[PDB]
Amino acid sequence: EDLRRRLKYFFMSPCDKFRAKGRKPCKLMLQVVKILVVTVQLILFGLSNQLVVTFREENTIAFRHLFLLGYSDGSDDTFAAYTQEQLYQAIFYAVDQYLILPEISLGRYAYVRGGGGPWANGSALALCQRYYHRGHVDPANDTFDIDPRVVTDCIQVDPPDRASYKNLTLKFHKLINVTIHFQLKTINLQSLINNEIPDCYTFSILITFDNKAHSGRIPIRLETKTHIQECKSFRLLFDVVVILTCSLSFLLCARSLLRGFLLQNEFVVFMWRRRGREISLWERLEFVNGWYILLVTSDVLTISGTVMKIGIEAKNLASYDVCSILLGTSTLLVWVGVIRYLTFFHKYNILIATLRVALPSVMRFCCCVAVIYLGYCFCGWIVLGPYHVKFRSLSMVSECLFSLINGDDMFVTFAAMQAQQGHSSLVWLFSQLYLYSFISLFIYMVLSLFIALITGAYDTIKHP
Amino acid sequence: EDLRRRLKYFFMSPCDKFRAKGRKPCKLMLQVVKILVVTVQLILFGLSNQLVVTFREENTIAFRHLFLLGYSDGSDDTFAAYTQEQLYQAIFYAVDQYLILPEISLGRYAYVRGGGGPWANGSALALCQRYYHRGHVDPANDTFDIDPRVVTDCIQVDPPDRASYKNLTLKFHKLINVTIHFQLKTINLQSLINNEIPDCYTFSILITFDNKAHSGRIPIRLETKTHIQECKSFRLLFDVVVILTCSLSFLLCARSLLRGFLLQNEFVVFMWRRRGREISLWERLEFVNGWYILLVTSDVLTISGTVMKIGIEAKNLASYDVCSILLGTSTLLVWVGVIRYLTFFHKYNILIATLRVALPSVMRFCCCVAVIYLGYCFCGWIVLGPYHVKFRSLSMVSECLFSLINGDDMFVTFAAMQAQQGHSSLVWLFSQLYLYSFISLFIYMVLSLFIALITGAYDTIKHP
Amino acid sequence: EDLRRRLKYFFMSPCDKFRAKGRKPCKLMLQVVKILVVTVQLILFGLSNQLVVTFREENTIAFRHLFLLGYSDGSDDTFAAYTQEQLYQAIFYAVDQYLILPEISLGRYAYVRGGGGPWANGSALALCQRYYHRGHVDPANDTFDIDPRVVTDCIQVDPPDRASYKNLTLKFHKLINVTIHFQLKTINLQSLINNEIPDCYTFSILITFDNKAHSGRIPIRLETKTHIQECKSFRLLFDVVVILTCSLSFLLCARSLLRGFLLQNEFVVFMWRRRGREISLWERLEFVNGWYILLVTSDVLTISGTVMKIGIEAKNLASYDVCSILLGTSTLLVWVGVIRYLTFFHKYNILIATLRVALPSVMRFCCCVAVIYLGYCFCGWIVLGPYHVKFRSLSMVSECLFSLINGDDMFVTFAAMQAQQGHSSLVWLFSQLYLYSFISLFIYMVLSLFIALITGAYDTIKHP
Amino acid sequence: EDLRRRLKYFFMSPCDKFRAKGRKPCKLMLQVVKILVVTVQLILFGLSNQLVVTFREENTIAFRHLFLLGYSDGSDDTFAAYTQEQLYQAIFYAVDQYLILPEISLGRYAYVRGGGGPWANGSALALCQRYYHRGHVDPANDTFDIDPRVVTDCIQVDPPDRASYKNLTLKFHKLINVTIHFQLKTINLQSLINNEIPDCYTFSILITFDNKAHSGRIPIRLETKTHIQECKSFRLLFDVVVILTCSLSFLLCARSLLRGFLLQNEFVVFMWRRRGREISLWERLEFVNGWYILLVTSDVLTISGTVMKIGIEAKNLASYDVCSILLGTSTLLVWVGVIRYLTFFHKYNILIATLRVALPSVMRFCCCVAVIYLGYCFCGWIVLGPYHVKFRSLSMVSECLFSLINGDDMFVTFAAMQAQQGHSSLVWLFSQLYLYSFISLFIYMVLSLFIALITGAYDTIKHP
Ligand SMILES: CCCCCCCC/C=C\CCCCCCCCCCCCCC(=O)N[C@@H](COP(=O)([O-])OCC[N+](C)(C)C)[C@H](O)/C=C/CCCCCCCCCCCCC
Ligand SMILES: CCCCCCCC/C=C\CCCCCCCCCCCCCC(=O)N[C@@H](COP(=O)([O-])OCC[N+](C)(C)C)[C@H](O)/C=C/CCCCCCCCCCCCC
Ligand SMILES: CCCCCCCC/C=C\CCCCCCCCCCCCCC(=O)N[C@@H](COP(=O)([O-])OCC[N+](C)(C)C)[C@H](O)/C=C/CCCCCCCCCCCCC
């Protein structure tokens, strides 16, 4: 029958199609070209992003050394002030170093007029302290008369062209935070020399003296925001080429999916009517090609990411996160799709089919063990949280347990529990039981069962 | 027979019971609701405890920076004095910083009159040194005339309202320890702003200069004890709801267990008399439902923990350890009990039954390997203890070996043995043999046998 | 026949022997008692050794802080002098701190007259510098006129009762090392208070300024040797009890081995003569009991270790290493021997026999993989040795590779190779190939084959 | 037939050949001797290289402490200057320490006249700064008038026999780097005393103040190049012996390969003509001996490495990398070739054949998983690169992922992602999904499938 022959044309391997009709498999070549071009585009994007990130990080480190009093490398998380004098000296040192920046900095930084932020009236530096509107606190008499309104008092500082901030008085009893805003603009000379494209950076520096905890310890932070700007192509052409290749692949895959859907409809209308027997939904799902779904998803992701990258490279978006995520996911998807080419040979198809037939039982076992994992996570978070640095937050607990079951950072956890004793022998004994039981169970039973499932699936595939 | 039909009603799946009698499985819904409510209660308790712990830790760090002379972060375990001058300066610095606390601290701390402890006569700070009653020690002449009575000499220090301690003279040759007791009370402003509940903390600060070792090195420690106190609801209602749900679940499960016991009694009295044949204890154990035992245990633990949490949240107990342990264990138990729902489908029941039938042989192999593990622990503790930081105590030895068999911190152990050489080539050679033999055996035979046991159990389950 | 019945009495389980003759298995009870007593003795010995080691280590740390100029904790391996002034100040600081020790030390240390060592003429401190007899070295003119004779010039320093060393002049161009010898004696007050046994320690302190490398960097070390001495029982009785129990067990096991040998001789003389057929050596080996060999070995080791421990506890040997090794090995052996009791039940015997029948093929595979492991060790040592801290010595290379195959410290090795680049791209590429190939092979083939061997042995045992 | 008998002589085991013809297997003894001699030569070479490397490293550390202002151990990667004053003080300190080296150094270092490098006119020290020809940069006005020509301005410094550099003025706005070149020569006294061979080292010291990044932070580096020179045997004889043994082994193996090729040619010309049937290429490959190929490769590598080592030991090449690589590869190859001896016994041949028959499917599975691994590498590099220190470069990403799949440095990666939050919740969520999916897949499916493949191959070998 015509339907039988047309269905036989479907599901044949590309080699069989070439034997039957002598049509060159140009779709396969197109997909290979797509893999190559998307990988090249991702590599170039990554190299440029690496350069930009390195420049930003080095400038931020230089700013930290320039403006933070007594700063040392590797102490960002513990850098804090503990006395009123320390806070005053830190703030004054930051402002003073700002005021004499041209004659001390190794980098060519230029002041930005009006860069003090929204709280500045055109001054380059803004020194703002925020405190509660009314903050009469009396721990001795147990008085908490508090007005939750926040009051922002700012001091405007301007650099000399070509000292009222010294009279700053803090409100420690009701202080919330102290912030310093200013902007510095410079030129990336490596970009000037190498790629001849003049990139002029603008760093927005924010120094925070955070007292939101009101715990007597005020951490000190320095953060930067960068605005790239051209200051008075092969990449764009390659991006256009990538977009065109992805669009062509998407069109071909969509047409193939439509043809498969039409063939499925013809088969079902023939079988339900001429033969009378009703067919199931699995017979419908057999007609779809999951590889084509993967390909169209990768094409859509690549097209969106390439549009975003074109916008970014023209200094218009500066939103690298979403574009990078899209491009990386698309590249991963195409490199996974290479498995379809690998599946056309039975020797590789044995292993691929072993994985495919093992997947359902593996997922079921994952569902079975997820509840035990979650119970252990909750118990560890609630009990060992106050006493263990690795159990402070639920995500941290999950990461610690996942590392434990894979044999990483075990003795560190045990020694952390041992050194402080947990401030209670009962807590220490519970931690011993908890860790030993969890590691023993998840390593010597769950992993072994995963291995057993995979081995059984391989045995079934090898001996049908 | 009536007994046969009633026993057939027992052991049927919930779906079969619904088919037979059309009774909605409301016990299952009750257990799901119980899981949800206990998880929510545990999450809320954990968040509040996290806030309290963070506040306490930050205040303790601030106190360490304020009162410990030359203190630096990350040096608590090595912070010590080595000369008489160092000890004198440390003590005097602590007291002096206490006396000028209001004008230097970033936190609003208030003095506590009469907070010097039992050894104070109403003074805020107590500076006590403890020494032996008679301590004439002559290492040159080998004289050890010692009276083991301890003498406590205290100095009372009071802060100014709105210097005799400078004449302190120590008895180094017979000194036991020097301690400083005082209390500071403050207000948690985050609690004031966010949850509007005024919490007034009271920190009991104890600085210890410990000379109990009499080894010429005196470690210096700072410890704090916190007493939370309200200073002049949804949580309680949710706790009551959790208690009621757990009580209802406990009642239903106990009634089901009683019905099962009655059915077992009827079956045994029918079989032993009418049929004459004596039945075994395993036939008795078959009639019990282990899931119901787990559920009633979790209910009891949750009820006790919720009562303790209600007491704690009213500022009456301040004993978080036991309540947290009970709540975490109950949450873990219910999340494990979810496996009973998972067992009603044969696809998941295959894996669950594989684990169940593998458990006995796994336990037997654990018994077999425990003696070898203990022998290795004892040998390592006795030999490598004097030369390895990881082998100082038996629990430390067990943790190190358990980490070793799971492939963690191996090269660190080897390098620790190598760097010092063990001060003997014989000890180094023994350590090489010990570590290599232990790791090789336990990784390449014991773990492989665990995998083999699990695989065999899975093979038996898959092919009955 | 009589021989058949007597041989049948041999090899029966203890339960079968009890059934046959009604003889209480008192040898088993004796061995259990032996296990208990040796474990208790080892635990007590370990606790006492822990106390002694802690005291010695704390005193050594105090000495390092007292006598080493600018010393900081955790910098022993890098503590060195780099200029002539630094060396002079270090030596002078050490001697000056020695001369004013009583008025600065927190520990009660007494001077030891005549403790300066062999190079002192009765003075308490000896300051000796060693240099070549003739050391005219001219790097500019390439002159190496050297007399390898070493000349020791000493300066005698005596503490005041109840400054010529300042004129010390070094010979840097030919200097070998500078050493400082003195002794301090003290009293362990914890021993005085707790166990009432007066222990008077004598520390031999040696400070070394080593210039044997002649590399312009002189490391500085402080080492101590301790001589314990009583200064003007249950333990001994328990040691005697342990010795008696071990001797009785040794006698019984030797008698049993002799009886087995006699039975083997009777069987062989009957079979070779009456039956004519010649029997093999495996039939001889079947008659021996390996558990009895283990027991007699453990008894001999325990007896030797207990004699040494008795000698040590009387302050006569001070050689803890050999005694500790003997005692630990004996304890490990008896805890392993518990497996014989475990073997009397078939459920545990299944696993034990699985291990026993897997052992030969496991050993053969170990022989197969040892040559590859050794080749990789040699290649890594010769190539990556100059560029990797983990490949400096052959034992270090072996430890690093053994940790690598067990999934420990992998990224650390990779990052160490990456950070310095190996000072050559060829070396970096070779390191990449070397590490990837080694880890891949040994993890994904060798370990899998070990698992396969164990699984096959278990399959053979389970299905005979 | 004659051909059948001659082919039967081929492929027989050495024991069978000895039985047939009584010829002593002297080739096997020659190969054993070769293994021994190459291992001994490699060990001696490694020991000498260890001594040289240790001397060079110690001298470099001494130079770093002598010439780098404020240098501390373990801070090479972060050592940098951040102000103009800091750079000036660092440069001046380096030059000043050079000028007074004889009276401060602990090592006997001699000045080298004319050692300032190509940029020196015979002076011992060269202080050169490099800057752009025209470097008018105006970040405020966005001006980048740049002439990419580099201008090198040098200052010549000469040590006193038996201060114009103080007037050095830098061009920070256009500075590229500042370098200091000088040479110091010394004598290795350990070589003088121990092996009596006078080795006179010449260190070329280069201090770099790198401003190529133009980021306001100037890293400071010290690098040394060493030229060994004899200054006014058993090793050579052993090298000659090794060369002769390798040449003899190569000749014998080549002759055996030629004989095998001739036998293959005779067999093919007989079978294709007399029998008519055409044979395949696998029948040709069966006649070759892979062990002989391994042996000749190892012989060639050893001969080349020994020639290079002979050249090096005469102070003529100083290129240790290539020689070490060749020697290590040859030693690894011969230690692998020991497996051929192991293959002559069927008990070991079982395991060896298991590995051999598992190799093809293992390679196919590696090809299958390589594409997924590469996709994950690309995605991680592009996304987590800006936010993770472990994902900066593609090789670093590959090393991190390879360590992750083997259960190493997992929690460190998770905590690195957690601590900074990735500066975006979307990036953090993506990192969670990425890491969890990658680790789960590669550990619980890929490794299990490798184990299953090995187990299946072992099952096929065990039960033919
Ligand atoms: C759970 C489902 C089935 C899983 C099956 C897999 C089991 C593992 C498989 C093979 C065995 C591999 C190794 C097992 C290691 C077990 C170690 C147990 C603890 C040994 C303690 C010795 C030190 C000592 O004896 N410790 C004692 C002496 O102390 P110390 O002298 O060292 O002083 C320390 C001081 N300090 C203040 C207390 C810190 C100490 O006082 C007791 C501690 C209690 C230990 C808790 C035991 C919890 C074990 C339960 C685990 C269940 C799972 C089974 C595991 C076999
Ligand atoms: C035990 C039950 C059965 C278990 C079966 C599983 C076995 C493992 C499976 C597969 C093999 C995987 C790798 C095996 C690694 C074995 C390494 C052995 C030691 C190699 C030493 C090389 C360095 C050197 O040759 N080291 C020598 C040269 O020193 P150096 O030049 O490096 O200088 C160092 C200086 N220092 C002062 C000594 C520190 C050194 O002098 C000797 C050391 C003795 C080494 C002890 C050997 C103990 C091994 C017994 C283990 C038994 C279990 C079987 C293991 C196969
Ligand atoms: C060997 C017997 C059989 C064993 C069978 C088991 C095999 C493993 C099983 C499953 C697969 C699991 C993961 C495999 C990971 C393989 C990674 C290969 C290297 C990838 C490099 C990407 C980074 C890059 O592409 N790196 C390139 C780009 O550099 P970059 O941009 O990162 O810059 C770095 C700068 N620097 C100065 C060079 C440091 C770099 O230039 C090339 C490096 C060469 C990499 C060496 C490859 C050696 C692999 C041989 C191993 C053989 C064994 C088989 C393994 C499959």
Side-chain angles (χ1 to χ4, degrees), chain A residues 418 421 428-429 432-433 436-437 440-441 444-445, chain B residues 359 362-363 365-366 369-370 373-374 377 393-396 398 402 405 442 446 450, chain C residues 47:
Chain A
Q418 186 136 64
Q421 206 43 225
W428 181 85
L429 260 165
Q432 291 293 284
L433 288 155
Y436 276 115
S437 68
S440 290
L441 165 69
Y444 307 120
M445 296 197 96
Chain B
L359 197 46
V362 161
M363 286 340 265
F365 191 43
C366 293
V369 303
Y373 185 87
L374 273 177
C377 283
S393 92
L394 261 171
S395 59
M396 227 186 306
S398 179
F402 195 67
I405 69 194
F442 264 80
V446 174
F450 274 119
Chain C
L47 295 174

Side-chain angles (χ1 to χ4, degrees), chain A residues 173-200:
Chain A
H173 52 293
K174 64 218 281 206
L175 185 72
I176 292 163
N177 52 25
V178 182
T179 49
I180 294 166
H181 309 79
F182 57 96
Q183 288 178 60
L184 304 173
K185 63 207 327 293
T186 188
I187 298 186
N188 191 356
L189 256 173
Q190 333 179 252
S191 89
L192 264 287
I193 298 309
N194 203 87
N195 58 63
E196 282 179 340
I197 296 292
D199 279 326
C200 278

